[PDB]
Each structure stands twice: as C-alpha cells, then as structure tokens.
Write a protein that binds this ligand. Structure first.
Ligand SMILES: O=[N+]([O-])c1ccc2[nH]cnc2c1
Ligand SMILES: O=[N+]([O-])c1ccc2[nH]cnc2c1
Ligand code: NI
Ligand code: NI
Length: 330
C-alpha cells in the first residue's frame, strides 16, 4: 500500500557517488552487463542521463530523489526487479548514443526515464494471471494491465515532494514528455509488440516509413522499448543463461499459484516441466526476439550488434537441444 520514498541518506549518497573511470568506456557498448556492479547501478543511471541529456537536464537533487525512490518501488522478485530496470535503461542508452540525433532532447530524457520505470511495482505475476483471476488491477485496466499500472506508479513517484524532475519543462513539453513515457511503457506489453513489428516491417518494406510522422515515431519508439526490455537475450551466453534462470523462477511461482486455483499452468510456468524449457526458448527467439531485432536493425542500422548477439544465443539454445551444453553455474 502507498508509494515508497527513499531516505535522505540514500539520495545524498547517490549525489556524491563517482563512477570508476574504466567503466565509462564499457557502458557505451551494447553487450555491457551491469550484473557485476550492483552498488553502482543508480550511479550508472545518473551517468547515462548526464551523458545523453546533459548534466543540467534535471536538477541533481530531484534526479537523485527520483532514482532512489524508483529503486524502492521495485519489489524483491526474481526477475522484474531493480536490476532489470537498469538493464533495460542501459540498452536504451546504447541505442540512443548510436542514433542520437534521430531523437529529440525530450524523447531521450523521456525514454531513459520510461525504461527505468517501465516495470515499477511488478509483483511477479503476468497479465494472463491478473485477468484470469480478476485481480482489482484487471478491473481498473482492461488491457495492458500491468503496464498501465507501471505508468501510474511512475506518475505517483513524480508527484512526491521534490521528485518532479520534469517540472522545469514548459507546460507544453511537460504534457509531451508524459505522453512519450506513457506510450513507451504501454509498448512494453508484448501483446502489442506482434502487431507493432508487423506494421513497421511493412512500412519499412514499402518505403512508407517516415520519422517525421508522429504515429511512425511512436511505433519506432515502441519497437525500441521491446528491444530494450528483451535485451538479456543480447548479452554474452553465460549472462543470458543466468538471467533465464531468474525469469523462470518467476514463471514457476505463478504456475504454482494457478495449480492451487485448480488450473494447470502453461508448460512454461510449470516447474515440473523444466525439460521443455530449451524448446520454449527456441520458440520465444523465433517468434519474438529474432524478428524484433531484425526489424530494429533494418530501421536503425547501428543497432545490428543486438541482432548478431541474439542470433548467437539462439544458436546456444539450439546446442542445448542437441545435447551439447557444457558446464553451467547458477
Ligand atoms: O567518460 N566520461 O566520463 C564522459 C565522456 C563524455 C561525456 N560527455 C558528457 N559526459 C561525459 C562523460
Ligand atoms: O529476456 N527476456 O526478456 C526474456 C527471455 C526469455 C523469455 N521467455 C519468455 N519470456 C522471456 C523474456
Ligand atoms: Ni513489463
Ligand atoms: Ni520489463
């Protein structure tokens, strides 16, 4: 109940944090893994905002309050947590850096914030679960149920005293950025991805795609959000495999709850069906990840390293299926 708020110690501590110099160079690369640097994650986000948007984009105090309160409103769930938030924001940073002038100052600031906030207050349950069992959230939010909640949580945090990093925008730009953030968070509903990718693929192939057309921009930003949300599949294989362990930890816990309610879960969420995981991952890469990065690379050529890495990980799941896995640690 209610929106959590960071301590004075938390945000002043972030304000005084300095990132090690060696990491500056690494943070620029798509394949960077934040995993080994947990104490640095909020600082890494500051660095990224400052480098993409400028050190004077946001009031430092308000930015640090905002970031540390965001962290406190992610739950201690296995996957949809603070680590995932920062990972997704880093992918967006890398995309923005490589495509900087295609996006406005307002878009870049909105999108980095949108990524950091896009899974706020996730409870470890899917839209499928919330709607099957008529959680109050599904009554309030008929479609894109959790994503509408994540956006509401974002607005809640911005409304905390001293947390409104967007207050200094003109009334007009303020409305525009909240709309950028809303559309971007809603776009993280994978249900909407399939239609979005199909549309973009067609606009690209026919040559009608036009980034001066707001509806096209929205769709391209949507596909960027998908690419960033799924970016664990673009890391080096050991990182991808460890992250999959966390994703499935969540899935199996939801599946367990469904069993208690008399319903057999999908195999993906069934802890007694772990043998089907490699084929399930193959399915996910073929149906979701590979097409996403394929179309993204067509539209934004600098994003090709994401696709190449995704392809390498597909090959790894294939090796698993053929019985070729080597030693893994968890
Ligand atoms: O390495 N850096 O700390 C670094 C390099 C370039 C930048 N431009 C704006 N902030 C920067 C930080
Ligand atoms: O990294 N992911 O976002 C990711 C990877 C595999 C998945 N399987 C089902 N959902 C997934 C999400
Ligand atoms: Ni989500
Ligand atoms: Ni997410």
């Amino acid at each position: 109940a209610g929106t959590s708020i960071c301590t004075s110690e938390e945000w002043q501590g972030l304000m005084q944090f300095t990132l090690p110099v060696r990491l500056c160079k690494e943070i620029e690369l798509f394949h960077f893994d934040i995993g080994p640097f947990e104490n640095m994650w909020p600082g890494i986000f500051v660095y990224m905002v400052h480098r993409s948007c400028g050190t004077s984009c946001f009031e430092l105090e308000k930015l640090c309050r905002f970031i540390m309160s965001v962290k406190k409103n992610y739950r201690r769930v296995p996957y949809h947590n603070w680590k995932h938030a920062v990972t997704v924001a880093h992918c967006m940073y890398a995309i923005l850096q490589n495509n900087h002038t295609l996006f406005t100052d307002l878009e870049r600031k909105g999108l980095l914030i949108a990524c950091l906030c896009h899974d706020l207050d996730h409870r470890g349950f899917s839209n499928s679960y919330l709607q099957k069992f008529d959680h109050p959230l599904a009554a309030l939010y008929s479609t894109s149920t959790m994503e509408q909640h994540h956006f509401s949580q974002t607005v809640s945090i911005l409304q905390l005293e001293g947390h409104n990093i967007f207050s200094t925008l003109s009334s007009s730009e303020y409305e525009q950025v909240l709309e950028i953030i809303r559309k971007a968070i809603i776009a993280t509903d994978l249900a909407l991805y399939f239609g979005n990718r199909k549309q973009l693929e067609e606009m690209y192939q026919t040559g009608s795609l036009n980034l001066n057309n707001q509806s096209h921009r929205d769709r391209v930003i949507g596909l960027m959000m998908t690419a960033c949300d799924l970016c664990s599949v673009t890391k080096l294989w050991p990182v991808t495999k460890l992250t999959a362990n966390d994703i499935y930890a969540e899935f199996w816990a939801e599946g367990d709850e469904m069993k208690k309610l008399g319903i057999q879960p999908i195999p993906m969420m069934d802890r007694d069906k772990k043998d089907e995981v490699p084929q399930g991952q193959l399915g996910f890469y073929n149906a979701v990840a590979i097409p996403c990065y394929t179309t993204l690379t067509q539209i934004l050529p600098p994003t090709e390293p994401l696709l190449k890495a995704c392809r390498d990980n597909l090959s790894q799941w294939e090796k698993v299926i053929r019985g070729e896995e080597t030693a893994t640690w968890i």
